[PDB]
């Protein structure tokens, strides 16, 4: 197999800038390279074939160049719809092989999360477990921290979180954190609080509720 090495692993770029993706082959492959875009939860989309040849329906701002072992995909004037993973493929040598992908991140102004806390539903409580959900919505940059406090005691070992991929429409991230307790333990305490830190916040934001109020 020909190894294709894509760099860098992530490319963070400002709207309207020209961006270039690197694909390097372990041996010369002539111009036998193809490029794909893959948006979140979508299928690959052919952008460029044979290093530089255009594809029907792909914007002119996409172009490719290079030969031998050194290849580049370029986007002129990057925009939000370009947020995606980008892959190269060679087929000079059987079997055809693919690079491991470069992720495109689009920079935007700092946006603090909007924070929301959700008590467990009465229906779930019927079943013996209590999930408390904290939502951090539409923030940038991606780094954010959630601290759970129950009756003002910092919790550890009972929460899990998930972060979305960058939103192609507004360039933000969102994050969900779930605190899981037994119903019995949930009912032994009063104040449930999600405390959030983020670059866009000069002090932590806390969203809380009193059980049963």
């Amino acid at each position: 197999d020909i190894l294709l090495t894509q760099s860098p692993v992530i490319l963070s770029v400002s709207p309207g800038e020209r961006v270039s993706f690197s694909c390097r082959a372990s041996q010369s492959i002539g111009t036998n390279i193809h490029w794909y875009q893959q948006r979140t939860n979508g299928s690959p989309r052919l952008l460029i074939k044979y290093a530089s040849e255009s594809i029907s329906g792909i914007p002119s701002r996409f172009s490719g160049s290079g030969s031998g072992t050194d290849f580049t995909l370029s986007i002129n004037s990057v925009e939000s719809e370009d947020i995606a993973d980008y892959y190269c493929q060679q087929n000079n040598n059987w079997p055809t092989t693919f690079g491991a992908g470069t992720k495109l991140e689009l920079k935007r102004t700092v946006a603090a999360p909007s924070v929301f806390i959700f008590p467990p539903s009465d229906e779930q409580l019927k079943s013996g477990t209590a999930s408390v959900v904290c939502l951090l919505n539409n923030f940038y940059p991606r780094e954010a921290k959630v601290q759970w406090k129950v009756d003002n005691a910092l919790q550890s070992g009972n929460s899990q979180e998930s972060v979305t991929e960058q939103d192609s429409k507004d360039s933000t991230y969102s994050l969900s954190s779930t605190l899981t307790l037994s119903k019995a333990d949930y009912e032994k305490h009063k104040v449930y609080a999600c405390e959030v830190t983020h670059q866009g916040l000069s002090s932590p934001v806390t969203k809380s509720f009193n059980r049963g109020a």
């Binding site: 299928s43 806390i117 959700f118 998930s162 779930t178």
Partner: protein, 221 residues
Amino acid sequence: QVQLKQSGPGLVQPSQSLSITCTVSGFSLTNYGVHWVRQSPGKGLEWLGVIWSGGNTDYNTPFTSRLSINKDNSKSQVFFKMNSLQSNDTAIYYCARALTYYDYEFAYWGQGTLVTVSAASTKGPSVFPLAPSSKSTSGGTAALGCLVKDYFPEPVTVSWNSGALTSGVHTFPAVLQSSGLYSLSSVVTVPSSSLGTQTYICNVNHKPSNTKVDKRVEPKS
């Protein structure tokens, strides 16, 4: 329009086999080969093999002894079958067609089939509401959602109001709980002024367990 459409995701046990069907339209299987490619976090995209116009097959070296591709030209269907599966075969499997009958320039792709290889058993999710509150409504916008808890394997699909509500929806990546079951949440932000009259239903589909659940998400007095 060229289209390729794949069968649904599912769970297979280690040492057993997977079968995927790719139904094509807009071209004849007698004139184009159909390729199979898989994608996993950690092995990237991997080409598996191809069935050509005339029925010849090529299988990539790792798979020559456990892969079989055949087809039904008359019904425009290609059948991918792989044997002796192990954990590292968990992946999204795609069918694809090239621009040219003989080439590998993959212009057309199926939507992918998530196959999970594990000894565990299938379990459908429980769906609970994430109700919008009053003390939580921020400048004419409210957040609400659904918690989709304790299912296996991936994936679940979530829509809102049967696809009529898409703006402001965030369906989060699933987390694997220590129990071995997945959980995820789906949220949407909507006008606070709408909460009284507009209904919000999350539609959760878990094909491996043939589970379909609709959950109405309501304010509380």
